[PDB]
């Protein structure tokens, strides 16, 4: 749905759809070359549905074609500085594709704007939908829009006849977080049964390692997900499927 969504919002007014409790394959996101832009940064793009994360965010908007460069880890530029900034430790991928076939009025779309004025660049994932007129000069910009009072919000003119460098592109960026809490989505790899007392390769709820699995007398506390060792290394894990 979010990819085949009929509509997108502006870059400054960028959607942040939270995603949880899924079975993500991403397989359709490999074969489908419909995404002219597909640049995983945190992880190898091929290796996703073999991994999984606590939570994932789907930020969506539509921007100018060239600006796809601006959305990069630590990238610089007006959209990046005034409309949407990526985390320096970006954990995920960026999906962008041309939307001229959709985001183009015959007379040109005015529907998509961008904030080109701000006295302080946004933090990563910050979202400033502020509408108030921007004071360009030093005058007290008192409700009068115009000289020394410029409108920070400027619209894209998306005509079908514009250049590709100016052509509208549909973009969705996914950000992941591989944290301590149980993951909400994991890729399609069917589990197996418990095994005891054998040097085996294991992978629990995404946590990977090798060794021998033993029951323990460890008194976890009813919330405690799992333990670690004084080497900050894993000591014990709880089966998701069994306490």
């Amino acid at each position, epitope marked *: 749905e979010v990819f085949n969504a009929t509509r997108f919002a502006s870059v400054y007014a960028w959607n942040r759809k939270r995603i949880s409790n899924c079975v993500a394959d991403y397989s359709v996101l490999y074969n489908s070359a419909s995404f002219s832009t597909f640049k995983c940064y945190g992880v190898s793009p091929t290796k996703l549905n073999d991994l999984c994360f606590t939570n994932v965010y789907a930020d969506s908007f539509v921007i100018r074609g060239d600006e796809v460069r601006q959305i990069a880890p630590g990238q610089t530029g007006k959209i990046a500085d005034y409309n949407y900034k990526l985390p320096d430790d970006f954990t995920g991928c960026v999906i962008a594709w041309n939307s001229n076939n959709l985001d183009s009025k015959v*007379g040109g779309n*005015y*529907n998509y704007l961008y904030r080109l004025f701000r006295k302080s660049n946004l933090k990563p994932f910050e979202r400033d939908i502020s*509408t108030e*007129i921007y004071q360009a000069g030093s005058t007290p910009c008192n*409700g*009068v*829009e*115009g*000289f020394n009072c410029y*409108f920070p*919000l400027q*619209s894209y003119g998306f005509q079908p006849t514009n250049g590709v460098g100016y052509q509208p592109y549909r973009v969705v960026v996914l950000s992941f977080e591989l944290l301590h809490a149980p993951a909400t989505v994991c890729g399609p790899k069917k589990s197996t049964n418990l095994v005891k007392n054998k040097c085996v390769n294991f992978n629990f709820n995404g946590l990977t390692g090798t060794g021998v699995l033993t029951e323990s007398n460890k008194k976890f506390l009813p919330f405690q997900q799992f333990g670690r060792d004084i080497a900050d290394t894993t000591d014990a894990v709880r089966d998701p499927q069994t306490l």
Partner: antibody
Amino acid sequence: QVQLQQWGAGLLKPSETLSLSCAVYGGSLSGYYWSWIRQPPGKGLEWIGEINHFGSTGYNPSLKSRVTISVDTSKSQFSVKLSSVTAADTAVYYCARWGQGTMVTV
Amino acid sequence: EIVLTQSPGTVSLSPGERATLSCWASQSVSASYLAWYQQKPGQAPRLLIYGASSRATGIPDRFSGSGSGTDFTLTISRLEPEDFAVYYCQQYGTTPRTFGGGTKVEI
């Protein structure tokens, strides 16, 4: 394609109110700036109010606290509501971002 | 409060002559905030020049604007048989957007 049709004009008794209609075709009123322009018979143009697409709106001092402009994105129509009308408000109101003109007699 | 002083109030000219419309403002208008409108009799306002230097889209090249500060000047280098209309200038450098009284182009 691009056309702005004005409506809501007519003769009005003093101190009454009025609501303008400005039907736009081919334009996104919520996405482009809109203003209403009046012209009394034999005078020049007088900018009364303007509405920024994001929602911001302003009114000239002669219509301050008496006029109210808004838009129905549900119909993509520009509206200019004036209250406490008088003789001096008689002017030809055409809506522009121009329209066809709507004579107001009061 | 910016009152635009257009002169002359009337101008009679023959076709092919150069017609200049003068537009002075009571206060200096920053960044050439001057817009020109030509209003045919019984017709709606029609934009001619924007920013006092940028002509409107589709307006003839015979139209030309000039001036800076407290002077705005509209030039029609070669008069046209349909150029005998009222021209009103509008200054939008202040919140009270104001226009000039209009100059009538006669025959």
